[model samples]
Target: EDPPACGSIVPRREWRALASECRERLTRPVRYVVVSHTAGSHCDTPASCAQQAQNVQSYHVRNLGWCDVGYNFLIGEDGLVYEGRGWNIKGAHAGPTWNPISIGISFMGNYMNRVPPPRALRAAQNLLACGVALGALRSNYEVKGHRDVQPTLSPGDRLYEIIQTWSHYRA
Candidate 1:
């Protein structure tokens, strides 16, 4: 049987996340979660969304010369979660300070003027629950928008506003 689900995530292998050169691991239970947006194209179908995920990994790995895709997980507009560096690895998202202490979960699209589909939002929150369930994230883990810790308008304006209303959001 396939291994147990990691909080409903589509495994990196399944989503075709490129092999990573990164060896750093984040200490758990991760106390912070940083939410971001790709600020790129958005997709609705499973096939298109998968390709979007691939494109993201390519940018982080090839163009940026990073070891792997930056986020710990990527949530698609199709309402599915794609694994990136996964739970145990430290992501290159946000900045150096928060990168080591926070789990990065980036939505795969621009949210500056528009909101992600409801399913996409649901998938993200559910993934957080799964993180808590598996002890990868602290029960009281705080969620912060990318802009909260960085200067970018990431996670988008609409998403940033919505995330502010979430129970776990902290400034």
Candidate 2:
């Protein structure tokens, strides 16, 4: 994936904004893109009053062993890609086997239950482009949802379907 293409503080609203710093750091050709590295789940909604859905979605990656957040980038319910471990660095997402050499991005919502907003989708794609520029990903890299690799149904069908349409990270 390349670093974000957008000039300054590109918004991470479901899309990617390659930070200039990241672009300069990447030193190789990104091959593929992984999927569903992090899942930001929430119980709060119009139906629910209290935010008690247990914002878990990132269990798979975090449980493994990360310095802090599992995914390198995390999209909050607000459709913002709050800075996570960030690109250019080894993410604890995926697994130890995969984390060291991959870029991980996670949306803060349960896609299985709801479709991510267009903002989120756009941000994800843009970010993917950023990764490409950063030499972390390629346009043809294998983009897959978390469920594609692991048995657990993460990122849900709605999200997975969307993820398939976009370019993503790879091993």
Candidate 3:
């Protein structure tokens, strides 16, 4: 099922997302959310964030030969949520096993040595809340860092520390 539209998100058009060829859909009321990081550059403004989003999509589509950008949604340091594959599509972020069941929400930059701005944190939390309210996420959904289930250093150390303290975190 496609996730209910959350009004707070910046739509795909705003960021000039290319047409997505991805077709796999996730089950409704998704049980998990995998948090990740772009590990590229961070953007604190609309213009730069849009560019960053485009860059990510390009890498995923061109280099990786993926149907679309991997994350289901991307959170910008500018306090905005940029729609990626949105809520319904299976994301390529977490890996084969985790991708089908989880909604991957990636923060726009590396957070190993730096903390995301407070507004950025707030935007991500609020996005999750909206997901629950709209029935995109199960009320009891759990959150996990990319590193929790994968072998890579994704989501980054500092952000991983922060999400570990969230109420719904698992492992």
Candidate 4:
């Protein structure tokens, strides 16, 4: 039997997130994963990342008028994954066509000019493996950079290059 995908996540409760006002759910064994970047300050400590996670949720809720944070998960430089609506929730991250079909993960900082430390990258890689193990993602799930499916300047230059080398990544 496989373990759950909750292994590396910093649950909303610990991050002090407000309740999600969203109700949409995603179909199981999702076929795709879209990676993006948050494009701002980076947090390398649990306390700091917790605050950062709170700020992000607040922006999507109070500023952007979304039901919750857009990404399904947020990766922190602290080498942890911050839960954002978790595995089965529909995210507002990608465009309409993709929102309902894939899981969206955004690294917690700008990766345009620099790469996340190896620890941070390892956390994300483990999350994906755990997703498939728990059957939340398809065993053959394809990974796409944010730029690939949207006109967004996310999953930035340096970071996008790194994900391209992953076995699951597709152009």
For all predicted structures, in order, the TM-scores are: 0.97, 0.64, 0.96, 0.96
The best candidate in terms of lDDT = 1
lDDT of 3 at 136: 88
Candidate 3 or 1, higher lDDT: 1
| Clash number for candidate 4 | 0
Q: Model 1 — which ten-residue stretch has the worst lDDT?
A: 1-10
Estimate candidate 3's alpha-carbon lDDT, on a 0 to 1 scale.
0.92
lDDT of 4: 0.91
For candidate 2, lDDT tens digit of each residue in 105-148? Answer: 67666688688777666667767676666556655656656666
Q: Give me the overall lDDT of model 2.
A: 0.51
Ranking 1 against 2 by lDDT, winner: 1
What is the C-alpha lDDT profile of model 3 across 1-171, one tens digit per residue? Answer: 577466388888889998899999999899999999999899999899998999999999999999999999999999989999988889999989899999999999999999899989888988999889888899999999999989988899999999999999999
Candidate lDDT (C-alpha), each: 0.93, 0.51, 0.92, 0.91
User: Number of the top candidate by TM-score?
Assistant: 1
Q: How many clashing pairs does model 2 include? A: 34
Better model by lDDT: candidate 1 vs candidate 4: 1
Clashes of 3: 0
Predictions ranked by lDDT, top down? 1, 3, 4, 2
